[model samples]
Target: PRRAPAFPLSDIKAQMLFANNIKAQQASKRSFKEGAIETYEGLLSVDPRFLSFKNELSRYLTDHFPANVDEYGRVYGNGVRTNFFGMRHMNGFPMIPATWPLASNLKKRADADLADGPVSERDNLLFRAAVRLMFSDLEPVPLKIRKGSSTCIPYFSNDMGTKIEIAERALEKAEEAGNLMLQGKFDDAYQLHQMGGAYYVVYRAQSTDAITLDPKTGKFVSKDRMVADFEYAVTGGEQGSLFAASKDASRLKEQYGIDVPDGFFCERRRTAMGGPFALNAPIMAVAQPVRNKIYSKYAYTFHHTTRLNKEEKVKEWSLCVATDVSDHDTFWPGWLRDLICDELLNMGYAPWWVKLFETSLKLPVYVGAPAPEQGHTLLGDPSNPDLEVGLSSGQGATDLMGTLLMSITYLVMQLDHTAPHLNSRIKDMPSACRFLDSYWQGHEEIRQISKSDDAMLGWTKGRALVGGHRLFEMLKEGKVNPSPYMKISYEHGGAFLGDILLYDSRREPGSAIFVGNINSMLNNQFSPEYGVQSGVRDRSKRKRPFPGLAWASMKDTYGACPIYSDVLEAIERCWWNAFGESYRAYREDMLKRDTLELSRYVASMARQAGLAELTPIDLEVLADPNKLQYKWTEADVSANIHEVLMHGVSVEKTERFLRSVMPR
Candidate 1:
């Protein structure tokens, strides 16, 4: 074609090799299977009363949803995995569709049986599910037989069933303890809550793992030690650990010994750098060069995964990389050039194919394009030419599924990069790419990280950004704003905060802010994942098992947009008191101490929020009854502010004038 660019896609074969090697490294460190199962056990152990619930649920899933395995391969294994090991009967897992209907079914069951009021009933079922879901780690440890290796089907099934049963029992015991506590049977609950996993999860998720030494005999019982005995429930994990006189490293080292670790003692902070894939900043830099080289070796390997083979390797790699780059950030751009443009051309493929491939992958690739908004592009209103075609129907959605997956993966990848520099760009491609490139070199890099990090798994630091700052900024200042002008601003600003940005009226006119716990309401307006959507219709095909895959590509479009406008607007409102007087004081004091000014507020906020005290509260909001005021109807006060801004009302007299129109 005359329009074909002079620089053709070269050495695509190498790109694949690099991409795979990086992937392989991440895979080695992936704790999803263990993490998932351990997390579930932790939840149950914390609340032992749900033991019966675990028994019932596990029995049913095992007997009914038993890992979907074919005679040759384990279809849906019990262990952790992506795409239920390639099973999606409907949109959800073939075994159990945690769809709106299904969740509602369980909700209804919980509601119906509860003599407790609506709040209590809602709390019980919601909490039970949330706790269990958060904790359960299915590590995809299904017994696999080599393509044709014949294993005893019944034996395998029985073995799988037994392991699941054991896991179930442990989960049940923890649930029972928690339930007993919830019921106020404290004494009995305390005695029965012997499930170590329950407490372990709570401790692990909520506290930092540190060691300490005793000052008396140079012994160590560990200062700043996190107490598992209802400690987290007490002052909250972070606060309790901070205030309580503990023998943990932080406290002991500061109090008795030299400020730093002696001999070869690893500083707790120093050892924590190797966070998982979602949080590994350095790995991106450290691994990329290695990854690039690896991709060089296996760039062509991606050819095997795609429908096209060696002949189309460069073409496929170019399409994949270009699309990923153009749609998200230029994350895969360099890699694409290295893999497809360079490798393929070197292999003597035609230039047109490379351009075509690049064009095919070209979906609004901006630095901060949000996935939630991009996902809406699937509706096919006036999108970029690459994203305009809405497939009529087919097992394979022309670019529909691929686009969606990419969007979700992009978001997931951003979520995974939680290094100090990378933390804020959970969905922005350029920021994420930049963060990844410089994380290891950055002095503020997270200290402890490992090679076997799962890209989808998110660490606490990343969670704090999205759950606390981002969401808080969005709600107070983002699209769910009540006023017309502010709403417009929020709609504009939320371009990076995922769905909240996309569903804002700016992107999709007529959209209103969704108030309420969005995470729990996965089935309603927020149900965009293939697994969630597909399972809603049918229970057979549950889509891919990896939940992160659903939103991996979301950030490819909506991740980089800032919540600053929204956050600034909210800061003006000063909802400090709304957080409770203490928190309000803390907020003000912290700001004052750090001199967090408007320009530097975002960076400062990240620091202030990182103090252990704030992180857990945000997590509570995430796991518990997820609530945010922005989702609700804005107050009349905010409304007046909007009117003033749009109507030429002066800022000085605005408050006084607006007070006159108060509802009172």
Candidate 2:
């Protein structure tokens, strides 16, 4: 370990003096164009997306196609793209995007032809089987509400009448409170606030008879038994009604009777705090609706029917929060509030709420949460000690499936430019890209048609029309690739996983740990909680019901090659390459300055590459040396990359959990 002394300086003053002298000497020797080229080349050298694709593909190759069959197992030739299971199978595509379609000879015409093209009965059956495996044939539990016992299973989607009624009343009370505040009736306003706050309502549903797909018929059967409990709080806001038109002077003076200044009524600026939720000065307007929306919902569901003992499964849950953003638009009519609430109370209680709720709620609660209680649970028996849940392999696999669906979309778009034949054939071809097509079906009908079409085609075309066309053309011509002397792209990409990893570290230690562990799993590390090589399968065992395959089988299948050595090595190199400079700078800066300059330096580098613009939130964090230094600890960075990469597990309570029986 005693390799070499890092920086020569022994004291802070000496280090600063040395750094300044070096900077001055470089400045004297430097020219504007030379510095510009150097800056551009430096940006090109460590661009995150390029690094990611390179790392992932390289790792995929070595991990999947190892040398020496005796030492490993039956070493597979070539490589495959698949969900950790069955990569060596004939149907496997090359898993990583960069080396896509470079596998055993099957379709010289196009991979799209096999993926989504018009096929015969056998092909259709095969594709359908693949789809089922991808999702593990997870039958969605119907959205329903019930009363009496804590658990009841019925198909329910109706807006709970009492909850909606209470929300309407709460809205009315909010308007009254706003009016009183405007009139300077402090006591009246206070009373109204108390009343509105006290207007608590809950929409609870218990179900044990939720339907699911019959394995034999593929039709939903009532025989499918599950425990799906849900609840939502329609509590009134402490602030004025979000529906109140603050900008209308005459309307406010007459209706609410308030004459507050423009900035006073609506804050145009606020100090940015660094964390998971922090945003720059110009946060996207669309995000405002979800952030300020008050309606919150929660659920706990077990999707299977059999009455298994406590040790059989991990408890599962889902949640949704909702709100209306239509009122935010200046053009929204004042009377539309009545219609909005009425529509909210009917037709799935306002279509927009359902849309917003489902989209906003799924990720944090259903997919990634450590436990149902820690997630988005709104109502559950506190005394039920058996209600604890943790992220399961099944759930993680489903999440990975969704991510791959997205990855395929990105790849389809990328190929449209890089490989014209591949693009034109599959661009509008549903058979080729059915997964990407089905992913957007949940959007509003109009949006599904317009936005999805544009997103799939027009948006892709726009990106292709950019300098990406030239880049692809160069790639096709074999003129250049990512190598020394010629940096491929001249900027770091916002899409880089490293950016999110860094952001997670800066945001919170918990999130950083979570991201790191997830990244390790994605990198193909065997996770004891979830199972080893989650998506891969043995070729001989492909005939079994995909979901029925035990976690033990994967351990048996890839036991000899259990560790993800190659992928981990690549990830380590990639992380160090991307952030090694910052790490070194942070250590040196600790002696020279009170606050670390690494984050600021990183942000400035991003800005130079046009990958990110400094948000007031980001700048504020960067400016505070003590705060920045404290947050960006060496342990945080090291754990996020090295620890997680080396060992794909966390020391967190949930990570240590074993399966337990659900409480009755």
Candidate 3:
């Protein structure tokens, strides 16, 4: 049997033509060379994520899918052709250093289990459920707004505008009705309130095409793009005409100037018999203000106080004013509190710990986006760039919780490892079963609640939490082996928590300064260590570049109920500072020299630290230059530096790296 070629005729011809074109080949070679050089130079310039992924992928491809040339001279078994050819396409490079180890560790455990027996059906079912919860909330369906012929979606509206015009009119009616009531016009007030309440329902009712699922096909479908005209008034009439030329028309016409021909003012009330129901029905007649308010209290307050300097009247002075920690709006709503408490219960955290997390856990605010006056001022060094304000949830609140949750995951993991017996006792405690039940059921319940418009937002904050919770939940449920969800969540949540820790540590003053100061030495441009720093710059007096650095510098000292602050602080000082410095120097040496020194550095660091091994090729890729220009390459590099020095290098090498440079 003959098989067709992989490419089209046109593409085949194009390739042949290009391959033989001498001038084109020359030009292509030139372009390719420069681009390759540029990529190599720019690699790792962004962050360690890329570098780490680069290293991992390089090894993964080499070991698992190494290229082999057969007797026919055809190459086989390579990976990421686009990445290899173009030297780009680095997606999923937002690498978390912690995730790699966690992934490796999980695979080891999973492999051990599979060696004995295949995964069970129940295990698969539970794993699928956990996966569902992990991805429960994602992109939300956006609310559509309309104004006659034009429409737009908004994050939030400052002006009430056309979308809420009916609601605005109803509010106006309410104000009038309230005045009428004050003046003893009871009947008139009742009528106006009834109409106003009906307006609320009308506002809530969207008349556009409804999107729904087709029962048979299980795919989205829309029906009836437009609604039919109202046949009768929403208020009642004997026939389908409430505002006809009867007593109804007289008062409606005289007071509101509505004509009888305009049908009933509101939409028709469809009846069971395919008829418009009478407007003056008992339910419609008994209207006493729709009883509930649909509009948000904070909607369209039209409030802002812009303070402008005398010298720059056009620019707001407050734009340059730095917000203090107290000024940052931080709040933990009831739902979020309940969520934490429930999860803690299920995870075998002590009852007291669960209750404390629920009632007294004041989340620490890690600064994020650089504010006006927040730059070098907050960082305590004009030389350093602006410190990050904190991780933001877009809503601000959930971001903080996400940060806290990440912090807690590590603390719990470390405790479990440090005292396995205590961990077992905590999990086995009888009284805490209810707490675990609440946590497990609550986790499931929240997924349902998250189906609303804000699902994606909720998912973003809860994804990591849910993943961690599921893994622990599975462990408590007596799973000796890893399920698909457990492995997926473990790797993902581990990296996520590590990323959070890196950022939150930036807010810890002594620790942040240590990391940032060392980073500055490497990244300071004029320093001996210039070009040595592999990550984003956080040195004092530098112009703010990446917001990650700003977050890195905004230490959280005032968290009401602090956990892992001291532990992380010590890690930062004793581990990250030296580890990061050594890698920075290693990168510098590799760039200036060759792979020889880089290899030696890695081997020595690993040997002393009793850490993981790194090959010469790994060192060469890590030292690759072009990746430096990536968006988060610097941050990822910084993260990797900490991971490598902490886990891959010796304490002696770390101390050497730390003391290698003299203080500026």
Which candidate has the top score in TM-score? 3
lDDT of each residue in 152-183, candidate 3, tens digit only: 10111212253244233333343354345335
Give per-residue lDDT, candidate 1, residue 33: 16
Worst 10 residues of 1 by lDDT: 95-104
Per-model clash counts, in order, read 135, 23, 57
Cα lDDT tens digits, model 1, 406-429, are 322332232333222434443343
List the global CA lDDT of all models. 0.22, 0.22, 0.22
RMSD, candidate 1, Å? 31.7
Name the runs in model 3 displaced over 4 angstroms: 1-337, 346-348, 355-369, 374-594, 597-643, 647-664
Provide the global lDDT of candidate 3 against the true structure. 0.22
Query: What TM-score, over all chains together, does every model reach?
Result: 0.17, 0.19, 0.19
User: Which lDDT tens digits does candidate 2 get at residues 176-243?
Assistant: 54344335442343333321100001111111111232358743222211111121111111111222
True lDDT of residue 313, candidate 1: 21
In model 2, what is the error at residue 607, expressed in angstroms? 65
In TM-score terms, candidate 1 sits at 0.17
Q: Which one wins on lDDT?
A: 3
- Candidate 3 all-Cα RMSD: 30.7
